[PDB]
Scaffold this active site. Sequence first.
Site, PDB file in Angstrom:
ATOM      1  N   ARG A 175       0.721  -1.109   0.075  1.00  0.00           N
ATOM      2  CA  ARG A 175      -0.020  -0.195  -0.179  1.00  0.00           C
ATOM      3  C   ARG A 175       0.852   1.214  -0.072  1.00  0.00           C
ATOM      4  O   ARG A 175       2.014   1.244   0.207  1.00  0.00           O
ATOM      5  CB  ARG A 175      -0.977  -0.019   1.178  1.00  0.00           C
ATOM      6  N   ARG A 179       0.680   9.774   3.870  1.00  0.00           N
ATOM      7  CA  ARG A 179      -0.419  10.226   4.219  1.00  0.00           C
ATOM      8  C   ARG A 179      -0.549  11.891   3.882  1.00  0.00           C
ATOM      9  O   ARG A 179       0.331  12.703   3.831  1.00  0.00           O
ATOM     10  CB  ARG A 179      -0.319  10.384   6.054  1.00  0.00           C
ATOM     11  N   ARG A 256      15.372 -14.428  11.232  1.00  0.00           N
ATOM     12  CA  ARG A 256      16.242 -13.077  11.391  1.00  0.00           C
ATOM     13  C   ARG A 256      16.252 -12.963  12.773  1.00  0.00           C
ATOM     14  O   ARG A 256      15.371 -13.439  13.640  1.00  0.00           O
ATOM     15  CB  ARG A 256      15.613 -11.743  10.782  1.00  0.00           C
ATOM     16  N   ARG A 287      17.839   1.888  14.331  1.00  0.00           N
ATOM     17  CA  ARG A 287      17.410   2.873  15.271  1.00  0.00           C
ATOM     18  C   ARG A 287      17.623   2.862  16.481  1.00  0.00           C
ATOM     19  O   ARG A 287      18.568   1.797  16.981  1.00  0.00           O
ATOM     20  CB  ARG A 287      15.643   2.586  15.048  1.00  0.00           C
ATOM     21  N   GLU A 312      20.011  -0.722  17.576  1.00  0.00           N
ATOM     22  CA  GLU A 312      19.402  -2.197  17.069  1.00  0.00           C
ATOM     23  C   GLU A 312      19.846  -2.353  15.918  1.00  0.00           C
ATOM     24  O   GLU A 312      20.187  -1.700  15.105  1.00  0.00           O
ATOM     25  CB  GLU A 312      17.574  -2.044  17.009  1.00  0.00           C
ATOM     26  N   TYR A 363       5.332 -14.803  12.515  1.00  0.00           N
ATOM     27  CA  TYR A 363       5.393 -13.612  13.467  1.00  0.00           C
ATOM     28  C   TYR A 363       4.231 -13.219  14.071  1.00  0.00           C
ATOM     29  O   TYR A 363       3.125 -12.894  13.172  1.00  0.00           O
ATOM     30  CB  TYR A 363       6.146 -12.562  13.017  1.00  0.00           C
ATOM     31  N   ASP A 365       2.210  -9.973  16.674  1.00  0.00           N
ATOM     32  CA  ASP A 365       2.221  -9.108  17.532  1.00  0.00           C
ATOM     33  C   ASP A 365       1.279  -9.751  18.911  1.00  0.00           C
ATOM     34  O   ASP A 365       0.848 -10.623  18.686  1.00  0.00           O
ATOM     35  CB  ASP A 365       1.263  -7.701  17.047  1.00  0.00           C
TER      36      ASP A 365
HETATM   37  C1  LIG Z   1      12.133  -8.324  18.430  1.00  0.00           C
HETATM   38  C2  LIG Z   1      10.700  -8.388  18.905  1.00  0.00           C
HETATM   39  C3  LIG Z   1       9.967  -6.908  19.040  1.00  0.00           C
HETATM   40  C4  LIG Z   1       8.490  -7.295  19.253  1.00  0.00           C
HETATM   41  N1  LIG Z   1       7.841  -6.072  19.412  1.00  0.00           N
HETATM   42  C5  LIG Z   1       6.346  -6.097  19.631  1.00  0.00           C
HETATM   43  C6  LIG Z   1       5.697  -4.931  19.464  1.00  0.00           C
HETATM   44  O1  LIG Z   1       6.153  -3.583  19.574  1.00  0.00           O
HETATM   45  N2  LIG Z   1       4.387  -5.165  19.618  1.00  0.00           N
HETATM   46  C7  LIG Z   1       3.741  -6.217  19.796  1.00  0.00           C
HETATM   47  O2  LIG Z   1       2.623  -6.421  19.703  1.00  0.00           O
HETATM   48  N3  LIG Z   1       4.393  -7.344  19.578  1.00  0.00           N
HETATM   49  C8  LIG Z   1       5.577  -7.199  19.395  1.00  0.00           C
HETATM   50  N4  LIG Z   1       6.559  -8.364  19.494  1.00  0.00           N
HETATM   51  C9  LIG Z   1       5.867  -9.740  19.542  1.00  0.00           C
HETATM   52  C10 LIG Z   1       5.911 -10.260  20.943  1.00  0.00           C
HETATM   53  O3  LIG Z   1       6.928 -10.641  21.699  1.00  0.00           O
HETATM   54  C11 LIG Z   1       4.947 -11.244  21.136  1.00  0.00           C
HETATM   55  O4  LIG Z   1       4.113 -11.368  22.517  1.00  0.00           O
HETATM   56  C12 LIG Z   1       5.151 -12.707  20.926  1.00  0.00           C
HETATM   57  O5  LIG Z   1       5.615 -12.935  19.625  1.00  0.00           O
HETATM   58  C13 LIG Z   1       3.897 -13.728  21.328  1.00  0.00           C
HETATM   59  O6  LIG Z   1       4.132 -15.052  20.609  1.00  0.00           O
HETATM   60  P1  LIG Z   1       4.487 -15.970  21.752  1.00  0.00           P
HETATM   61  O7  LIG Z   1       3.948 -16.144  23.152  1.00  0.00           O
HETATM   62  O8  LIG Z   1       4.226 -17.422  21.124  1.00  0.00           O
HETATM   63  O9  LIG Z   1       5.821 -16.169  21.878  1.00  0.00           O
HETATM   64  P2  LIG Z   1       7.471 -15.945  22.826  1.00  0.00           P
HETATM   65  O10 LIG Z   1       7.312 -14.518  23.376  1.00  0.00           O
HETATM   66  O11 LIG Z   1       8.684 -16.257  21.895  1.00  0.00           O
HETATM   67  O12 LIG Z   1       7.217 -17.160  23.821  1.00  0.00           O
HETATM   68  C14 LIG Z   1       7.523 -18.385  23.583  1.00  0.00           C
HETATM   69  C15 LIG Z   1       8.362 -18.800  25.043  1.00  0.00           C
HETATM   70  O13 LIG Z   1       8.468 -20.305  25.100  1.00  0.00           O
HETATM   71  C16 LIG Z   1       9.524 -20.353  25.672  1.00  0.00           C
HETATM   72  N5  LIG Z   1      10.188 -21.895  25.266  1.00  0.00           N
HETATM   73  C17 LIG Z   1      10.848 -22.075  23.893  1.00  0.00           C
HETATM   74  N6  LIG Z   1      11.202 -23.061  23.968  1.00  0.00           N
HETATM   75  C18 LIG Z   1      10.806 -23.733  25.137  1.00  0.00           C
HETATM   76  C19 LIG Z   1      11.068 -24.901  25.716  1.00  0.00           C
HETATM   77  N7  LIG Z   1      11.634 -26.187  25.213  1.00  0.00           N
HETATM   78  N8  LIG Z   1      10.870 -25.610  26.939  1.00  0.00           N
HETATM   79  C20 LIG Z   1      10.099 -24.408  27.678  1.00  0.00           C
HETATM   80  N9  LIG Z   1       9.809 -23.042  27.276  1.00  0.00           N
HETATM   81  C21 LIG Z   1      10.387 -22.833  25.951  1.00  0.00           C
HETATM   82  C22 LIG Z   1      10.429 -19.111  25.443  1.00  0.00           C
HETATM   83  O14 LIG Z   1      11.450 -19.158  26.136  1.00  0.00           O
HETATM   84  C23 LIG Z   1       9.365 -18.212  25.492  1.00  0.00           C
HETATM   85  O15 LIG Z   1       9.072 -17.506  26.818  1.00  0.00           O
HETATM   86  C24 LIG Z   1       7.981  -8.442  19.264  1.00  0.00           C
HETATM   87  C25 LIG Z   1       8.786  -9.595  19.303  1.00  0.00           C
HETATM   88  C26 LIG Z   1       9.993  -9.548  19.014  1.00  0.00           C
HETATM   89  C27 LIG Z   1      10.835 -10.699  18.913  1.00  0.00           C
HETATM   90  C1  LIG Z   2       4.318  -4.879   8.755  1.00  0.00           C
HETATM   91  C2  LIG Z   2       4.714  -4.649  10.512  1.00  0.00           C
HETATM   92  O1  LIG Z   2       4.456  -3.750  11.020  1.00  0.00           O
HETATM   93  N1  LIG Z   2       5.582  -5.451  10.730  1.00  0.00           N
HETATM   94  C3  LIG Z   2       6.464  -5.442  12.074  1.00  0.00           C
HETATM   95  C4  LIG Z   2       7.216  -4.128  12.281  1.00  0.00           C
HETATM   96  O2  LIG Z   2       6.947  -2.966  12.336  1.00  0.00           O
HETATM   97  P1  LIG Z   2       7.646  -1.387  12.481  1.00  0.00           P
HETATM   98  O3  LIG Z   2       6.813  -0.512  12.818  1.00  0.00           O
HETATM   99  O4  LIG Z   2       8.834  -1.546  13.638  1.00  0.00           O
HETATM  100  O5  LIG Z   2       8.299  -1.429  11.265  1.00  0.00           O
HETATM  101  P2  LIG Z   2       9.816  -1.390  10.570  1.00  0.00           P
HETATM  102  O6  LIG Z   2      10.823  -0.438  11.308  1.00  0.00           O
HETATM  103  O7  LIG Z   2      10.297  -2.935  10.945  1.00  0.00           O
HETATM  104  O8  LIG Z   2       9.777  -0.979   9.095  1.00  0.00           O
HETATM  105  C5  LIG Z   2       8.913  -1.943   8.489  1.00  0.00           C
HETATM  106  C6  LIG Z   2       9.510  -1.671   6.791  1.00  0.00           C
HETATM  107  O9  LIG Z   2       9.189  -0.589   6.366  1.00  0.00           O
HETATM  108  C7  LIG Z   2      10.204  -0.066   5.574  1.00  0.00           C
HETATM  109  N2  LIG Z   2      10.639   1.265   6.421  1.00  0.00           N
HETATM  110  C8  LIG Z   2      10.360   1.571   7.755  1.00  0.00           C
HETATM  111  C9  LIG Z   2      10.725   2.261   8.446  1.00  0.00           C
HETATM  112  C10 LIG Z   2      11.788   3.433   7.911  1.00  0.00           C
HETATM  113  O10 LIG Z   2      12.246   4.379   8.154  1.00  0.00           O
HETATM  114  N3  LIG Z   2      11.998   3.125   6.491  1.00  0.00           N
HETATM  115  C11 LIG Z   2      11.517   1.971   5.748  1.00  0.00           C
HETATM  116  O11 LIG Z   2      12.143   1.989   4.424  1.00  0.00           O
HETATM  117  C12 LIG Z   2      11.350  -1.032   5.385  1.00  0.00           C
HETATM  118  O12 LIG Z   2      11.040  -1.651   4.159  1.00  0.00           O
HETATM  119  C13 LIG Z   2      11.100  -1.920   6.752  1.00  0.00           C
HETATM  120  O13 LIG Z   2      11.603  -3.345   6.364  1.00  0.00           O
HETATM  121  O14 LIG Z   2       8.339  -4.632  13.377  1.00  0.00           O
HETATM  122  C14 LIG Z   2       7.503  -4.675  14.695  1.00  0.00           C
HETATM  123  C15 LIG Z   2       8.219  -4.849  15.925  1.00  0.00           C
HETATM  124  O15 LIG Z   2       8.454  -6.390  15.898  1.00  0.00           O
HETATM  125  C16 LIG Z   2       5.998  -5.586  14.676  1.00  0.00           C
HETATM  126  O16 LIG Z   2       5.417  -4.996  15.452  1.00  0.00           O
HETATM  127  C17 LIG Z   2       5.229  -5.110  13.228  1.00  0.00           C
HETATM  128  O17 LIG Z   2       4.196  -6.145  13.193  1.00  0.00           O
END
Ligand SMILES: Cc1cc2nc3c(=O)[nH]c(=O)nc-3n(C[C@H](O)[C@H](O)[C@H](O)COP(=O)(O)OP(=O)(O)OC[C@H]3O[C@@H](n4cnc5c(N)ncnc54)[C@H](O)[C@@H]3O)c2cc1C
Ligand SMILES: CC(=O)N[C@H]1[C@@H](OP(=O)(O)OP(=O)(O)OC[C@H]2O[C@@H](n3ccc(=O)[nH]c3=O)[C@H](O)[C@@H]2O)O[C@H](CO)[C@@H](O)[C@@H]1O
Lengths: 386, 386
Positions: A175, A179, A256, A287, A312, A363, A365
Amino acid sequence: SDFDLIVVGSGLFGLTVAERAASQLGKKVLIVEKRSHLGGNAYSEAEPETGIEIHKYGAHLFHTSNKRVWDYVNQFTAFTGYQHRVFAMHNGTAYQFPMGLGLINQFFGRYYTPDEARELIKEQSAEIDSKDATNLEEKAISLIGRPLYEAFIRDYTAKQWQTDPKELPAGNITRLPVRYNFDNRYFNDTYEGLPVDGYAQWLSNMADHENIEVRLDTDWFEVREDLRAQNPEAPVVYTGPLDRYFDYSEGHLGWRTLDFETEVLNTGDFQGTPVMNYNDAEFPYTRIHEFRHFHPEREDRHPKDKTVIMKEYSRFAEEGDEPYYPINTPSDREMLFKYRELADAETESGKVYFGGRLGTYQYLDMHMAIASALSMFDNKLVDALK
Amino acid sequence: SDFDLIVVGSGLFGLTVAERAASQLGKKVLIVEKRSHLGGNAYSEAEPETGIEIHKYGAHLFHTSNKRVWDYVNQFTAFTGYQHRVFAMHNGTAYQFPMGLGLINQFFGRYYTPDEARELIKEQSAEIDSKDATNLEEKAISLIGRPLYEAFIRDYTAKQWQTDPKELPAGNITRLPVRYNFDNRYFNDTYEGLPVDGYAQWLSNMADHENIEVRLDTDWFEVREDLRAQNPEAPVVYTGPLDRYFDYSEGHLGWRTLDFETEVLNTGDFQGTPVMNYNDAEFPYTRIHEFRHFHPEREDRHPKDKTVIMKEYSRFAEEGDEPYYPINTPSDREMLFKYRELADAETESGKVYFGGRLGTYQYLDMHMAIASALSMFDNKLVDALK
Ligand SMILES: Cc1cc2nc3c(=O)[nH]c(=O)nc-3n(C[C@H](O)[C@H](O)[C@H](O)COP(=O)(O)OP(=O)(O)OC[C@H]3O[C@@H](n4cnc5c(N)ncnc54)[C@H](O)[C@@H]3O)c2cc1C
Ligand SMILES: CC(=O)N[C@H]1[C@@H](OP(=O)(O)OP(=O)(O)OC[C@H]2O[C@@H](n3ccc(=O)[nH]c3=O)[C@H](O)[C@@H]2O)O[C@H](CO)[C@@H](O)[C@@H]1O
Ligand SMILES: Cc1cc2nc3c(=O)[nH]c(=O)nc-3n(C[C@H](O)[C@H](O)[C@H](O)COP(=O)(O)OP(=O)(O)OC[C@H]3O[C@@H](n4cnc5c(N)ncnc54)[C@H](O)[C@@H]3O)c2cc1C
Ligand SMILES: CC(=O)N[C@H]1[C@@H](OP(=O)(O)OP(=O)(O)OC[C@H]2O[C@@H](n3ccc(=O)[nH]c3=O)[C@H](O)[C@@H]2O)O[C@H](CO)[C@@H](O)[C@@H]1O
Ligand code: NA
Ligand code: NA
């Protein structure tokens, strides 16, 4: 029995399933968690020197338009009125972000009205038609033009994917990322905020129930034979890695990862905003997060002269690295469909359900993990636990 | 009797006093209002062509840190999550506003960190010491420097006051108008928003009580002898003009007024934000309001192709003009103290209390009018109505 249900992993998926079984069905739930704490990657903690709440597995921003999810999470924590806003550093200037009348004014040198900006974008992007684009670079240019693409999209994208954008699918942009007003609210969702007392307190409250037992520092694969022998009929909800569960018999799924470089600085304010994107190739990080600004309501508990920041870095996940984002090459997709058939068979033979980010190679949220857990609870677990 | 209390004027001061007497003391209240509607200058209405909610006596933004006031007003209306943000048009560019890291970057050409911006402002403002400033111009320059003063303060101030800033009191600026972060929330108050169903519905709900009677299109001075003869002992709360009450026996108090030029344009979006200040002398108006953007939650009831804007002009109030802001020359102050002694005497002899913006010659925000009314109720009216 001592438990009626086993949940592997205490991320938001695991916590939601455990809490619903415990409170709605009155079942005894055992949560097995490999790490030293609850909450999965959403877990946060105080930085020791300053007391500021920080994250070690990525900054977590909560937002949703799903009212069921919003009402659900508010049983366990209140949320602040925080609204995420982001700024983009390009060539020594902090731009308003995402692309809108603000950035457009700053970048093209003077004010464009909404209608004038629409015209400008049509002109700039006229070069390539989106239907004719073969990769990410072209698809981007076909939508916003070369100057905007090269300033704010190219290097940032290259850093996150570790790949030239000419080598990425045209399908990665779906998309118009522009804005035609001055609204720089980053998310578009109905509900948004941060847990008033932090993520650790929120996630801990979810597991705090008379019917829930939590065992930390416990790997499922090391305790499973013993636990299931105690109550063979108890189902398992597994949210660990899908490929690891089946001994990588179909190969290793690719992810990743991220590196975080966290520093305490001797100033009260490093950048004056929670998140600054670094869009230029000369900066190796994508960032910088400055954690105090996520909770301005906590200012008189924060130090006046110190601040915590975090840079990061993005790269391919190797052995030892935390897997964060599925890569989803067609090779990855291939072995995923193979693992899905193994999982489906394991559910029918062993009463093991697969869910969550790691359990399904997808992935999620936080609100999407919760919704997915609420759905598995409603459509699968209620029946399996009668 | 048919009434126990008379309230002259149905602005927020009058409405608050009337509603408290009616609901807390169970008294019959008669409200006398000169205009064709309730609410005083806070009243809003639908523009006929578009249906968009607009104001004819100034745009009204509600904000307060007074929790008693906030809890009070929420009995009568819910509030949206609207947060006021303003942009400043200078020399063909829309600047982030108020002065902060955003404006500083845009104006001085590159990004300044919080600490670097503090240093920059110290340098720019070193020219004059605030203790040595004799007028507004100097006091401003002593705080932020000449370039910032001349770009964003001088002409705007000249337009609002119709006076060269060299002729204005150094006392008009009392604090540093610069933020050393990227926060562009315009107001600093704990609570903020707009009435979900508009001001007219809110203010109408305040007067909607079995014990309250409202007579519109009724001038107090034309009906007072008759009304008080019906119940001589009923006190009066007067919120009309103070000087007019005493037949201008001590002279006419001076006021600023505003002219509003309201247009319906054949576009869905004129400026992409609710308020754009025009800081340059070449534009005769001080700012433009675009009313649809105060209620983005109403977008699918708003027309896709039309919008209402309003240009605001400031000048001295003459006969016929609505009095909005007290001028407060020492001549004005002089006759005010004289009118205060007349009023105090009239209270003791006639049970007429004076309150509100017009009744006390003092500008009052909505929450300040409410607080002032709540105070008059508590400390004066409860006793006078036993
Ligand atoms: C870098 C990053 C940034 C994020 N930012 C956002 C954000 O801004 N907003 C948002 O809404 N979400 C964000 N998320 C997503 C957020 O973390 C979610 O809550 C998550 O992805 C939910 O999925 P989950 O509960 O399956 O996973 P997980 O958070 O991965 O939990 C899985 C759990 O299982 C455990 N586990 C794994 N293997 C085993 C095993 N063999 N035995 C026992 N325990 C085990 C792990 O230790 C972990 O505690 C982010 C995620 C990441 C990685
Ligand atoms: C589609 C989407 O929202 N994906 C995830 C992304 O969001 P989030 O808002 O953090 O988006 P990113 O910073 O990862 O950017 C996503 C993509 O937008 C483009 N980009 C973004 C910013 C910028 O300054 N320039 C640029 O070019 C790039 O192609 C980049 O790969 O990471 C978050 C943190 O895990 C997640 O919550 C979101 O679900
Ligand atoms: C241009 C402008 C913009 C404003 N913007 C904001 C804003 O953004 N935020 C904010 O919080 N506040 C704002 N205010 C203030 C807001 O209008 C307050 O609610 C108001 O000042 C409250 O004071 P009040 O009730 O005494 O006055 P008023 O609103 O002036 O009400 C007095 C009433 O008495 C009536 N009256 C006068 N003489 C007689 C008579 N002889 N007989 C009968 N009735 C009579 C008048 O018709 C009027 O209805 C603004 C005010 C103005 C003028
Ligand atoms: C101190 C104060 O808040 N007073 C009132 C003012 O607020 P409001 O926020 O609208 O402030 P104004 O636009 O009237 O500006 C106040 C003063 O700040 C300076 N200035 C402001 C903006 C700008 O771009 N350039 C500039 O120089 C000028 O000297 C000006 O006279 O009107 C509102 C609407 O009735 C009221 O709610 C406020 O109580
Ligand atoms: Na195109
Ligand atoms: Na100075």
